[PDB]
Amino acid sequence: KTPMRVAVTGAAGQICYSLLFRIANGDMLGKDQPVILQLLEIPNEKAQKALQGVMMEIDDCAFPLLAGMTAHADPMTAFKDADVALLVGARPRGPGMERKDLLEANAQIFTVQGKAIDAVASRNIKVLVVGNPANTNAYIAMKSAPSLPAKNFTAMLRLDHNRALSQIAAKTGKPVSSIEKLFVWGNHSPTMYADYRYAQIDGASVKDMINDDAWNRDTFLPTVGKRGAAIIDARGVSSAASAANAAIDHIHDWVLGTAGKWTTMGIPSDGSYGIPEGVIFGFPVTTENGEYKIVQGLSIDAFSQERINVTLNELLEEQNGVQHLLG
Amino acid sequence: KTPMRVAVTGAAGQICYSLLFRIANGDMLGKDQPVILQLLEIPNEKAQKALQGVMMEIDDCAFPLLAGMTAHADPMTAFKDADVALLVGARPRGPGMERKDLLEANAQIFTVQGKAIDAVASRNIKVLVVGNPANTNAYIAMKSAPSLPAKNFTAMLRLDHNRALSQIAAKTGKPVSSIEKLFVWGNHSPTMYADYRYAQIDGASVKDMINDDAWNRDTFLPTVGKRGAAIIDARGVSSAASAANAAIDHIHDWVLGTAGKWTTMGIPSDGSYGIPEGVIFGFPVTTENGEYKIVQGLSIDAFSQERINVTLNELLEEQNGVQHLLG
Ligand SMILES: NC(=O)c1ccc[n+]([C@@H]2O[C@H](COP(=O)([O-])OP(=O)(O)OC[C@H]3O[C@@H](n4cnc5c(N)ncnc54)[C@H](O)[C@@H]3O)[C@@H](O)[C@H]2O)c1
Ligand SMILES: NC(=O)c1ccc[n+]([C@@H]2O[C@H](COP(=O)([O-])OP(=O)(O)OC[C@H]3O[C@@H](n4cnc5c(N)ncnc54)[C@H](O)[C@@H]3O)[C@@H](O)[C@H]2O)c1
Numbered sequence A, B: 001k002t003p004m005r006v007a008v009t010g011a012a013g014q015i016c017y018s019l020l021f022r023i024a025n026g027d028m029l030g031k032d033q034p035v036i037l038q039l040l041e042i043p044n045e046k047a048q049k050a051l052q053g054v055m056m057e058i059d060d061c062a063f064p065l066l067a068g069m070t071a072h073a074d075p076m077t078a079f080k081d082a083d084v085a086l087l088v089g090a091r092p093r094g095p096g097m098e099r100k101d102l103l104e105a106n107a108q109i110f111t112v113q114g115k116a117i118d119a120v121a122s123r124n125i126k127v128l129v130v131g132n133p134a135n136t137n138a139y140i141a142m143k144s145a146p147s148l149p150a151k152n153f154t155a156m157l158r159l160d161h162n163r164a165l166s167q168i169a170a171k172t173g174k175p176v177s178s179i180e181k182l183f184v185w186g187n188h189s190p191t192m193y194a195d196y197r198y199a200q201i202d203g204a205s206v207k208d209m210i211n212d213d214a215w216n217r218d219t220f221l222p223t224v225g226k227r228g229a230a231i232i233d234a235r236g237v238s239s240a241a242s243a244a245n246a247a248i249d250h251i252h253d254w255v256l257g258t259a260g261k262w263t264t265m266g267i268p269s270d271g272s273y274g275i276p277e278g279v280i281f282g283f284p285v286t287t288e289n290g291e292y293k294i295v296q297g298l299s300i301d302a303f304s305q306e307r308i309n310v311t312l313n314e315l316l317e318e319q320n321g322v323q324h325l326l327g
């Protein structure tokens, strides 16, 4: 059938090296769906060269679903008629880079990329921001694309979700495949809040199996929250492969549906749970018909609104600092 | 169903970083087949640490097919009850390493690993050697495992096959998915011989479409033959991702079958095409019922036996140098 055009940023980087071959393999949009990859890297020769080699490798796999693949240096061309956009490329916080130097640098990447998507991408393109700071970058891009619907601008909280999903199965000794209703609120940061209060394994309450809140506050939350750094402790390098799986999961679920299951998505707030509007935020959502839907009525206890507080604040902080680039 | 136990070597390395997540995802043995990964790395702390991080990442993907995963430092334990073994780890030819220093180093890895598979693996384990020199390493291992059937010891020629598969679709402008009957003879080296004389696209003769033998001898063969190095020219690093796909393809096809299609496998010679017995060699094969079968009757013209000559000789050379380790 009609192949979709998938534009992916930072194509020559680590996440993409794991991400690109599974997209081409059909992991992200189904096995009966051909794809046209439109890759974007910075215009530097060493980046583009590397981007050339990666393309040579993708071909060397003989993927029957790959109906096309082009390399770009301009977002304006890489975003042309894109149905989906994975914004993985972002400016790393180098030596001397204060939090403010990061937000300012990345803001300028995302207003530009956001205006290009706004201009040439599909009128209902699904955007997903992986490059950090994910949530604030998805917001910038979203604000920079007034012709596109805000809800199409999401941020990946699915890595934190799959990591909380991993910790629980480990603790419960239960298959990770059977964990129902787990989710994550807020920012994709250690400040995130993995909420296990509603999760169930075989209908049984996960919270009640563990039957230990000290584990929750002291072990589950900090482990998930700092898992990324633990990967760097072991591997010496970031978590490319798992982040790339999360993005596959995010788009796959968003597009193909969760059939009732709850999942996590950094989406623009509609004011639910008291979260200010237009704030890209981790929310438990169910997907269907190509769209998400926030899970409502969840009881937010003292411990939770407190954690939801710290994560929203950090986000509000980041929004404040990138406002001046959104003139 | 009954999960198979997949032992994979060099787990903390590059090929594996791309390989492991697709095995767990079910790309290699089917989506209804759970797997138990049994990972092996050298006993060094930095290797094992890295191997720990990779395992943390595999969990962070919440793969429903992954019924288990353990890290090892001993082949004797990593090979326990293994149904399939991907021998990806091998000693790199470092500075000052003459061809002889390589074969001697790698020989000593494969006799040891070959005796351990021989001892604790399944009585009909499928072995596949990715670590270079692939063919000669698969031979060493095979010879070191007299209790197991020789035919179970293969070497990956599927990367050269998928690269020849890529070059042809590129030249013909035809989908790589439609190229029938292409194959590769000999050693996994630039000395390999991609044979397009029998390939067909929609029943049509590929050779006759190109209608240019100078392209064959001067462009197709050298490009495929030196594609690996071209990847290092562009990327700055080896071809991890595509090699990892090839291994998925090799095992997948070997196990699930090619349904009539021809593919390439470095297998122990039975004397077909005049190739000496027990010589791991690229041969066009069709798979079924869990086993391969050499394509017979292919006409071997002057140009071909000549190329088949250079590749067998190189292999015979490598065999000669590793004999003294096979006491
Ligand atoms: N979302 C998550 O859960 C999560 C998890 C881990 C890491 N990360 C983030 O993912 C991003 C990428 O990390 P990586 O390890 O893959 O990085 P990497 O350095 O290997 O790749 C980043 C790539 O993006 C490119 N790039 C830079 N500016 C670009 C631009 N203006 N336009 C197009 N491409 C651009 C770079 O040249 C680079 O190759 C980072 O911001 C990283 O911190 C996010
Ligand atoms: N078969 C092919 O078509 C093909 C293609 C490209 C590269 N290669 C080869 O693949 C092999 C691996 O390459 P890579 O880029 O993934 O390498 P890498 O260096 O990233 O990984 C090799 C890993 O194997 C481990 N190892 C070493 N000795 C081992 C042993 N004795 N037991 C268990 N593990 C051991 C190392 O610690 C290392 O982490 C190399 O020999 C390479 O040249 C083969």
Ligand SMILES: O=C([O-])CC(=O)C(=O)O
Pocket (backbone or CB within 6 Å): A159, A188, A189, A190, A191, A224, A225, A226, A227, A228, A229, A238, A239
């Ligand atoms: O996911 C990562 O690599 C980093 C991250 O957000 C964490 O540990 O909070």
Ligand SMILES: O=C([O-])CC(=O)C(=O)O
Pocket (backbone or CB within 6 Å): B159, B188, B189, B190, B191, B224, B225, B226, B227, B228, B229, B238, B239
């Ligand atoms: O596959 C590789 O990376 C190297 C190789 O065999 C080649 O170019 O011959």
